[PDB]
Every structure is written in structure tokens, then in C-alpha cells.
Amino acid sequence: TNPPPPETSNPNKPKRQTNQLQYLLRVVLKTLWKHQFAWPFQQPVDAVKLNLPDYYKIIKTPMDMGTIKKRLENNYYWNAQECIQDFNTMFTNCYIYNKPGDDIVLMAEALEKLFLQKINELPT
Ligand SMILES: COc1cc(C(=O)N2CCC(N3CCN(C)CC3)CC2)ccc1Nc1ncc2c(n1)N(C(C)C)c1ccccc1C(=O)N2C
Secondary structure, rough: OOOOOOOOOOOOOOOOOOHHHHHHHHHHHHHHHHHOHHHHHHHOOEEEEEOOOOHHHHHHOOOOOHHHHHHHHHOOOHHHHHHHHHHHHHHHHHHHHOOOHHHHHEEEEEEEEEEEEEHHOOOO
């Protein structure tokens, strides 16, 4: 079975929207979300549908852009670093589970390069 997905709201977690978090939603997430390689990353890994009995034995910190998008829309994060870390976790999980040269790894690397370009333009 699949684990429960990562939470996207938490009634006890303080909320904030800094100018950097605004940029992360309106520029960074939006740019990656519309990219041709976004589709594997727009929702949690469905280990049932993909028949991956070991995925959630290996990956204990799952993350995906659908979760990040909802977190940003909900003002779930306090700071930009929490959101940046979620993106980095998502890419890292792909690199852990898969192998060099797999199509999905090359897709993740292309999205990560674009992510890094856009993050370098974060407002100060
Ligand atoms: C919408 O959800 C999906 C749909 C389909 C699908 O069957 N289709 C139809 C054909 C389309 N193709 C047609 C041909 N075009 C050239 C491109 C589009 C594309 C869409 C396949 C996978 C989906 N989700 C998915 N999420 C995260 C993954 C992942 N898969 N992969 C694969 C992507 C490797 C992994 C596989 C195994 C283990 C780990 C992963 C993994 O790391 N990650 C992040």
C-alpha cells in the first residue's frame, strides 16, 4: 500500500508569506510545473499503480511538486529554505531510487538545473 501523502496544511504550524516564498510559488514552482518533464513530479509516487514494493522502504522522506504547490498555496511554510529543501528532497529521492542514465534521472537533472537558475534570482 501507499503511505499517507505528506501534509499540505497543519493547523498548529505557524504560516508566513515572505517575498521569497511568493517568488517560489509564482516564478519557481510555476516554471517547473509547466515544463515538459514536470509530469512525474506533479503528484506523490504511487507505489501501487507503478508496482514499486520497495520504493517506500528506500525512500522515507517522499516529496513531490504537487505537495509543494499546495504547501505554498496554503502559506504552509515559514521560510523559503523549508520550500527549497522540499524541492531538493524530491530530486534526491529520484537520484537515490533510480540509476545514472535512466530517463527519469535525466529529467530530474534538467528540472533541477532550471530550479537552480530560478532560485539564483530569489529576491534578497
Ligand atoms: C502521471 O504519473 C505517471 C504516469 C506515467 C505514464 O504511464 N504515462 C503515460 C506515458 C507518458 N509518456 C509517454 C511517452 N512520452 C515520451 C513521455 C510521456 C507519461 C505518463 C508514468 C509514471 C507516472 N508517475 C511517476 N511519478 C514519479 C516517478 C515515476 N513515475 N517514474 C517514471 C517516470 C520513471 C518512476 C518509476 C519507477 C520508480 C521511480 C520513479 C520515479 O522516480 N518517479 C519520480
